[PDB]
Amino acid sequence: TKLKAPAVLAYSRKINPTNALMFAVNWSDRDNTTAVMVGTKTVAGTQSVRGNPNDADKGNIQTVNFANLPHNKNTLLVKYNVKFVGDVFKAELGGGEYSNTLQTALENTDFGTLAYRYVYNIAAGRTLWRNRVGAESIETVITVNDQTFTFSDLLVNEFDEDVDVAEIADMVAGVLSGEGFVTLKVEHYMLLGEGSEVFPSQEFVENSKLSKQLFDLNGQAAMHDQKIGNAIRTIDTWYEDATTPIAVEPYGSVVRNGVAYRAGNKTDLFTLMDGAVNGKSLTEEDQMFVTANLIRGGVFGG
Template sequence: MAKEVKAGAKKAKSAMPSVLAFEKKLVPSDAQMFAVNWAERHGKAEGLKLQLKSVRGTISNRLSTTLESDPAKLDAEVEKPNLQTVDHCALPSDCDTLKVRFTLKVLSGVAVPSACNNQDFNDTYREAVEGYIGKTGFTELAKRYASNLANARFLWRNRVGAESIEVVVTHLEGENQTQWTFDAKAVGLHGFDNPAVAALAQVIADSLSGKREFALLEVVAYSRLGQGQEVYPSEELVTVKESKSKVLYETGGIAALHSQKVGNALRTIDTWYDGEARPIAVEAYGAVTNLGMAYRKPTEKKDFYTLFDRFGVGESLTDTEAHYVMAMLVRGGVFGQSSK
C-alpha cells in the first residue's frame, strides 16, 4: 500500500522537472539612435547613420620580453603599420543631443512555465509564486526596473559625460496615454527608493503580478553630449573574418542598441548577492563578465539553481533570496534538471 504524503511535506530534489522553461516577462525592442538639439529635443529627430573609418594605428599592446630587451627589434615593430577599418558613429556637428527610443512590454503569467513535464512540481511552484505575489505584489522588483528606466542605465557609455539626461516614459493603453518625465541624473544609478518612480513602478508591478494582462511602455531618452561627439551603438559579435575590425549594429539603416543590451541594463537590480551597494545584472551565477567574477557561487549556496530548487518545491526563502529567484524567472530561461 502506498504511503500517504502529508500535506505541506517537502518534495525531494528529484521532483525537479527535466523540461522546464520560462518566457521572459520584460520584452524590450531594439533602441534606435537619433540626433537632436537639446533646446528642440521633443521635435523632429534625425536618424544616426554608421560611418566607415580607415585609420593607421600605433603598436600599443604588451610586447614580448625579446622585443622589450632589443631596441632594434622594438623600432622595427613600431614601424609596422597597424591598419584598421572600423564602423564609427557620432552626432552631427550642429546637434548636441543623442535621442534613444525603444518600447518595452511587461507581461504577466510568471506563475505558469512555458514548458514543464512534472505536474507535482508545477503545482508546488505555482503555490510558491502566488505566495510571493500575495506577500509582495512584485513591488520591490517593479521599483527597481522602473528606476533603471528613469535613470537611463540603458544608455551605457552614452550616459557618461552627459551634461543633462532626460527620460520620458509613456504608458500606451489604447487611446489613453500616461506620461512621466524624469531627470536621470537626479534619479541616479545607486539606490532604488526614489519616490519619483512610484507611479511607473505600480504599472510594472500590476502587470507582473497579473492585475493587468500586460503593459506597453514607450521609452525615450535624451543625452546632451555636445556637438559632433561620438556615440556608442552596440557592437556586433563577428564570427567570420571581416574586412572591418569593428562592426556596429544598425536597424532600418539607423544606429541602434541591441534589445539584449537594453534588457541587461533593466535587470541590473541584484544588490542582494552580498550586500554591496553596486547592483549587478540578474544572472544564474551572478556573472559579471568584464570583471571575470561570479558573485553567486554554488559552493556558497547563493546561485539561482540552489535557491530555485528549494523555492520550487515549497521550501521557504528569505525575502532577498525570493526577490532574486523571482527576478530570474522574470528574466526567463531554460532551467530543467538534467537526468545525467
C-alpha cells in the same frame, strides 16, 4: 518528496524591449529627429598588445564602425519600447508540478521592489551604457498607457524613492504579479554635445574586415534589445558582499569582470529554486531574485 526539476524546464522573457534606435535631436527642439548613421572610419594605431614589445613598430591600421552626432544637433535620443508581460510563474515549456510549487513559493514575493527597480533602471537611463559618459543632463520620457512621465538625472546605482517611478511601477507590478501586459515607450534625451561620438551596440563578427562593427537597422545606429534587456535587470543587490547592482543571472554572472557573484556560495538561482519548491522558507531578497530570474527567462533544466 524532493521534486527535482523538469529536465526540459524553461521560462520565457517577461520583459521584452525593442531595439533601441538612436536619433539626433536638440535639447530644445526634441521633435526634429534625424537618424544617427553608422558609418565606417579607418584608423592608424600603434600595435600595443600586452605581450611582445618588438612589434610596437609599424601601423595597426584597420577599419572600424563609428556613430557620431552631427555637428548641428547636440542631443542623443534613444527610442525603445519595453513590454512587461504577465503570467510570469507559468513555465512556457517546462512541467506542471515543479512550476506550480514554485508559483506557490513566490506568490508572496515583493513585486513592488522588483517593478520599481526595473522602472528605475529604465528611468535613470541605465539602458544607456556608455552613452551616459559625458552627458550634461539625462531626460527620460516614459509614455505608459497614455501617461507621460519625465525624469531628470537620477542616481542610478541606488534605487532612491521617486513618486513617478513608483507610479509606473504600480502598473508594472500589477502586470508582473498577475496576467496581462504593459508597454513603456521610452525616449532618452542626453545632451552629449555637438558632434559627440555615441556608443551603439557593437556586433559579434568573425570574418569581417571591420575590427569593430556597430549594430544598425537600415544604417541607423541602434542598440541591441538584449543589451537594453540586460540593463533592465541590473537590479541584483542581494548577493554576497553587495556593492553595486549587477545583472539578474542564474549564477549572478558578469561576463565583463570574469567572476560569477552567486556561484559557489549557495546563493545561485537553482539551489534557492529547488529549496523554494521543496518547502524551505525563502527570505524576501532571494525570493525577489528567483522571481527576477523567472521573468528574465532561461532554461532551468540540466
